[PDB]
Amino acid sequence: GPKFPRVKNWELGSITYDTLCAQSQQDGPCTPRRCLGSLVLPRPAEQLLSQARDFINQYYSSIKRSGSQAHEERLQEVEAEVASTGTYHLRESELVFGAKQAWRNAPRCVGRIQWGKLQVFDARDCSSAQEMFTYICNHIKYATNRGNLRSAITVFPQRAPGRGDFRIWNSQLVRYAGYRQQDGSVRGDPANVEITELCIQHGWTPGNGRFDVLPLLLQAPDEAPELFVLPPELVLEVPLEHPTLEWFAALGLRWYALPAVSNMLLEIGGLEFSAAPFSGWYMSTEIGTRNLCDPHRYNILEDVAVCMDLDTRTTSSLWKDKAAVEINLAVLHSFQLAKVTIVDHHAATVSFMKHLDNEQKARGGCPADWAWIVPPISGSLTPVFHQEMVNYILSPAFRAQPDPW
Amino acid sequence: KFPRVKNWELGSITYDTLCAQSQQDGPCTPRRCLGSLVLPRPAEQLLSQARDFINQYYSSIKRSGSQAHEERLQEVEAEVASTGTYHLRESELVFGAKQAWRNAPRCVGRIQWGKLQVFDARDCSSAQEMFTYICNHIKYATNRGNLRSAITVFPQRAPGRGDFRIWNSQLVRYAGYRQQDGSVRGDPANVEITELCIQHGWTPGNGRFDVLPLLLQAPDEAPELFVLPPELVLEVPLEHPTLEWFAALGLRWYALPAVSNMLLEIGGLEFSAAPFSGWYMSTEIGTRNLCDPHRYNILEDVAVCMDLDTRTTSSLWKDKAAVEINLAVLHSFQLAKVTIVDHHAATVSFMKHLDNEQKARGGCPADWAWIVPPISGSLTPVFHQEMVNYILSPAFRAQPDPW
Numbered sequence A: 001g002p003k004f005p006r007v008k009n010w011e012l013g014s015i016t017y018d019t020l021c022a023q024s025q026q027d028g029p030c031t032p033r034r035c036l037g038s039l040v041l042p043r044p045a046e047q048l049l050s051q052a053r054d055f056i057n058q059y060y061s062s063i064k065r066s067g068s069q070a071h072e073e074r075l076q077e078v079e080a081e082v083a084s085t086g087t088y089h090l091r092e093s094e095l096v097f098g099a100k101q102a103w104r105n106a107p108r109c110v111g112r113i114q115w116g117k118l119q120v121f122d123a124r125d126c127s128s129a130q131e132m133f134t135y136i137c138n139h140i141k142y143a144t145n146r147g148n149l150r151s152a153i154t155v156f157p158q159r160a161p162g163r164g165d166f167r168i169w170n171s172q173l174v175r176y177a178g179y180r181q182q183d184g185s186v187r188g189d190p191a192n193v194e195i196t197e198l199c200i201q202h203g204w205t206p207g208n209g210r211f212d213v214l215p216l217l218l219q220a221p222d223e224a225p226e227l228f229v230l231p232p233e234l235v236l237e238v239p240l241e242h243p244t245l246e247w248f249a250a251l252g253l254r255w256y257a258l259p260a261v262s263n264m265l266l267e268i269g270g271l272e273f274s275a276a277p278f279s280g281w282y283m284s285t286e287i288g289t290r291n292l293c294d295p296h297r298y299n300i301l302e303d304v305a306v307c308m309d310l311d312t313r314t315t316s317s318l319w320k321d322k323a324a325v326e327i328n329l330a331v332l333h334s335f336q337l338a339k340v341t342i343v344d345h346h347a348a349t350v351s352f353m354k355h356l357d358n359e360q361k362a363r364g365g366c367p368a369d370w371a372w373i374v375p376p377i378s379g380s381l382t383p384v385f386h387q388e389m390v391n392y393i394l395s396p397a398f399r400a401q402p403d404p405w
Numbered sequence B: 001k002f003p004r005v006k007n008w009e010l011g012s013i014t015y016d017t018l019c020a021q022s023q024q025d026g027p028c029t030p031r032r033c034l035g036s037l038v039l040p041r042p043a044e045q046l047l048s049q050a051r052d053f054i055n056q057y058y059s060s061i062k063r064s065g066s067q068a069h070e071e072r073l074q075e076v077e078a079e080v081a082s083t084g085t086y087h088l089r090e091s092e093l094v095f096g097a098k099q100a101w102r103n104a105p106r107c108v109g110r111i112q113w114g115k116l117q118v119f120d121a122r123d124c125s126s127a128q129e130m131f132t133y134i135c136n137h138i139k140y141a142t143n144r145g146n147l148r149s150a151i152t153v154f155p156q157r158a159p160g161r162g163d164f165r166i167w168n169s170q171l172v173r174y175a176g177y178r179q180q181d182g183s184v185r186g187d188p189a190n191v192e193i194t195e196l197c198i199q200h201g202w203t204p205g206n207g208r209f210d211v212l213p214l215l216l217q218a219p220d221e222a223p224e225l226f227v228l229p230p231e232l233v234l235e236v237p238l239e240h241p242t243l244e245w246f247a248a249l250g251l252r253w254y255a256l257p258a259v260s261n262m263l264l265e266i267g268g269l270e271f272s273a274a275p276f277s278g279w280y281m282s283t284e285i286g287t288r289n290l291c292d293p294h295r296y297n298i299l300e301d302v303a304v305c306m307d308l309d310t311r312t313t314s315s316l317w318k319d320k321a322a323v324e325i326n327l328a329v330l331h332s333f334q335l336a337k338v339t340i341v342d343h344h345a346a347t348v349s350f351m352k353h354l355d356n357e358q359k360a361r362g363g364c365p366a367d368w369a370w371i372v373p374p375i376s377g378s379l380t381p382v383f384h385q386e387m388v389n390y391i392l393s394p395a396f397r398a399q400p401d402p403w
């Protein structure tokens, strides 16, 4: 048949061919000799212009004015700007399209059915660390919306020739402190040990809890990062209880409402937005499975299993599986009681299948990273497990970038 | 470039250098990864695969460069030059089969790769004889519940003629009967092979767990039908340690997972019929075979029996029922003294395998999507372990169905 990858769903027996992958401009890490799909992060005058031309072409196609006079004029105007300055600038509506397209292009995101519904805050006028804070607080207030969460991104000024970057040092806008103890263990979230210690080196007075919300370390160009404490009333958290296990509330577990990634680079048309935090709402497994049960995170499985009186001395009791399921259930139940938006892993994966069909019809495929899209409990119980996926890099894109220190 | 391979739970890092030994391309390119696809789409080359394989063998027995090694290379050269093909000595076959298992990227059970009973059935000239060898394989491997890994190797592919083939995908398979009203009674995965048995003379049953006969095919002949003696096929009724109603569901599964439709390639030679078996990991039965929607699909029935709220996904009724079903399988196999490994023990053993292999060969090819179990992924260590996938030979391969 077609010379595009054939893609099969083994639950349903249905077949598609991905033609979209033909548009990839950027090589991933695989070769015919070996596949590196399971690695988390495997290792410009005329180069900018070709990325910019491509992006402008994407824009004009999206508004159905390809080949138009307005399209040709924008193209000239971009090359003139690069010509005289080395860079160029997006129109507002271009930025909005490019931000959404970056989300839509993100292979690791199961929540892409929502991609067209993204509030884009333009913060390209921002000129200080103090102003970044205001923009960030506004983002948090808008996005949180007292529990009825709204997807959003806030875009700060782009990288510029020989000027320092805007950066948010924290990986997320909300992070619990991780305090290294004398014995070598950690109180709080071990994922955050390094940022915690950077906050302390930069003048923060540390708490001693398991859920101390961290301050933000915000860096305006060519300045030391400045420290900003989020007013507590802005940071919506959800205490965790279980619907029938009454003792679960006594564990004092909690999580925050708003998942807002702040350390990734938004690339659009070769332009690099080094600070562009974005937020959605949580899939319940992120909290109840990874953040709470990973051995290298809060690691609470054994404690919960012991409370549930399970036999923790043997694997074949499936004590881990039982406790994990109850932890996820408590996450879902508590978020529901508190009226804070959340999506379980069944509803989310079902919606992603719908997204796949939509994208097949709209673009001829959808880049997806199977290992990231399949949830970390109950995998084959979700429809995405049975769905082959093709993974490739399209731009606009969100990318990892090196830590600023 | 040698990939840096990180474990994200422990922060430990290795470099896979074994991948340089791959002489066989997989489906990925720098423009797109196809690692999630289940099956993506001359004398001088036989000689090079043959020399390489003989070189692997003499090196395995340390005698790399000896008289015996050099003479054996010439035998292989002489035979290919004269006939376009060659034959393996039994010791070479035994080594090659083990190595194919070892190299199988999708197998989580490879800590066991060195314990493999290898039956040479290359002196087989008929479907009848294949059946005798298969019965002996089942008897050995089953061993009254104390299961033992095994492979039986029937005669290789030859340019002149049809292949020896076992038509069935496994040696034990439950019938799947389609109903004019669309539904399937039994195992929907075996509708086709069920229908093929009927068409070749089998009197069907009408249960949910009717064990199929084998269709065995000798070269250029119609396949023949052979009913396995019920006494040879060990099965485990499923009950649950606390939920009494669960036994009333009538569920069971067989003890012996024996794959019979894959080709075994050693030194360029191809073995189209080479059934191989180990023991089950509980999630293969409890999660996939019983809970897949296109398999026995029993999740709902179990949830109702547990009185769960089936109206909404957010009660996690599915997750809760799947767990009890896996528990029942583990409990039932244990009660019956039939070998089984749960998915926590299995993946822990695989992590140990990765480490042994790192020391021994500088790597291990592994397919993360297959290694990570279908429930409780991130609760197992392998979820957090990066993996490099690539094709080494000797290898097991998929091959076209013979009809």
Ligand code: HEM
Pocket: A103, A106, A108, A109, A110, A111, A112, A114, A118, A151, A152, A153, A278, A279, A280, A281, A282, A283, A286, A343, A348, A372, A398
């Ligand atoms: C609206 C609800 C949303 C849900 C339920 C959702 C769900 C998810 C989940 C479960 C992941 C994997 C996270 C992990 O394991 O750490 C993820 C990754 C991601 N999503 Fe979303 N998403 C949502 C909205 C968004 C939005 C608004 C953006 C960007 C504008 C976005 C971009 C991403 C990116 C870039 C990743 C990859 C992160 C990385 O590589 O570390 N998603 N999404």
Ligand code: HEM
Pocket: B101, B104, B106, B107, B108, B109, B110, B112, B116, B149, B150, B151, B276, B277, B278, B279, B280, B281, B284, B341, B346, B370, B396
């Ligand atoms: C001794 C205990 C064994 C265990 C627990 C085990 C476990 C597994 C599991 C869980 C899978 C994934 C199966 C699936 O999802 O359908 C698998 C695949 C496989 N194993 Fe094993 N294995 C064992 C022995 C063997 C032996 C003896 C061989 C060969 C001699 C072997 C070769 C394979 C191959 C080739 C596959 C891939 C099959 C395919 O592509 O569909 N394994 N193993």
Ligand SMILES: Cc1cc(N)nc(COC[C@H]2C[C@H](OCc3cc(C)cc(N)n3)CN2)c1
Pocket: A040, A041, A111, A171, A259, A260, A261, A278, A279, A280, A281, A282, A283, A286, A400
């Ligand atoms: C927007 C959004 C919604 C939602 N429900 N969940 C998220 C979670 O994304 C969090 C992001 C930050 C960590 O990144 C780890 C990481 C490390 C490295 C080296 C690369 C990479 N891409 N990702 C895990 N995923 C984000």
Ligand SMILES: Cc1cc(N)nc(COC[C@H]2C[C@H](OCc3cc(C)cc(N)n3)CN2)c1
Pocket: B038, B039, B169, B257, B258, B259, B276, B277, B278, B279, B280, B281, B284, B398
């Ligand atoms: C030896 C062994 C031990 C154990 N515990 N489990 C097994 C399970 O193997 C069953 C085998 C047959 C199915 O084949 C599906 C399949 C289809 C296709 C087109 C290709 C392919 N490689 N695999 C999946 N795995 C085998």
Ligand SMILES: C[C@H](O)[C@H](O)[C@H]1CNc2nc(N)[nH]c(=O)c2N1
Pocket: A038, A039, A040, A371, A372, A373, B008, B383, B384, B385, B386, B387
């Ligand atoms: C090694 C492996 O790639 C790594 O643990 C991945 C697997 N899948 C994942 N999937 C999601 N959604 N998030 C993750 O952090 C990971 N971790």
Ligand SMILES: C[C@H](O)[C@H](O)[C@H]1CNc2nc(N)[nH]c(=O)c2N1
Pocket: A010, A385, A386, A387, A388, A389, B036, B037, B038, B369, B370, B371
């Ligand atoms: C599409 C996807 O690759 C397919 O569902 C795979 C996923 N992982 C698997 N893993 C195992 N062990 N066995 C399988 O059959 C599958 N199926």
Ligand SMILES: [Zn+2]
Pocket: A030, A031, A034, A035, A036, A037, B028, B029, B032, B033, B034, B035
């Ligand atoms: Zn790949």
